[PDB]
Design a protein around this ligand. Structure first.
Ligand code: HEM
Length: 153
């Protein structure tokens, strides 16, 4: 898992996100959708967004970004002891939303990108290492639930 020092770095980085949850959330989703247009198709409510300008102007997209990062933040604050929080998310994303684990990889990468984009020179090598470990743990624990369900896509 992560060391206490690594968790401290993760939660310090997370304070940056908490100062503007909606802005970070919006940028993460836009990075996901523009880099991987197939992901947009999983969202009936965002399929109509045909340009990035439309994405940027969508208040509902910002709202969903807030929902997403709020859930992730709650998980991170558990420092790995997140079974109760993570299980339901894994199960909704596999069974209802049909989100392949690859797309969770994509959004994890998007989070790292957005952190550098919004905080250039202020997301240090140690911080990137710790946040990466935290996102891998999240993804990996979701993957275990996906395997239980026999879910691939
Ligand atoms: C950090 C990773 C993610 C987190 C924390 C997250 C969190 C959430 C939450 C809290 C909800 C609403 C409750 C629920 O249905 O379980 C939700 C809904 C949803 N998620 Fe995710 N999600 C993540 C990644 C993804 C990805 C990568 C996709 C697709 C590429 C996706 C697709 C969806 C869809 C289609 C819904 C239903 C949206 C609606 O129509 O309201 N999620 N997500």
């Amino acid at each position: 898992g992560l060391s206490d020092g690594e968790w401290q770095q993760v939660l310090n980085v997370w304070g940056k996100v908490e100062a503007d949850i909606a802005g970070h959330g919006q940028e993460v989703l836009i990075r996901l959708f523009t880099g991987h247009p197939e992901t947009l198709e999983k969202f009936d409510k965002f399929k109509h967004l045909k340009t990035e300008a439309e994405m940027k102007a969508s208040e509902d997209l910002k709202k969903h970004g807030t929902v997403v990062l709020t859930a992730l933040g709650g998980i991170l604050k558990k420092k790995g002891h997140h079974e109760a929080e993570l299980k339901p998310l894994a199960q909704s994303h596999a069974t209802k939303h049909k989100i392949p684990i690859k797309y969770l990889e994509f959004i994890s990468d998007a989070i790292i990108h957005v952190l550098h984009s919004k905080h250039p020179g202020d997301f240090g090598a140690d911080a990137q290492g710790a946040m990466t470990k935290a996102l891998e743990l999240f993804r990996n624990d979701i993957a275990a639930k996906y395997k239980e369900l026999g879910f691939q896509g």
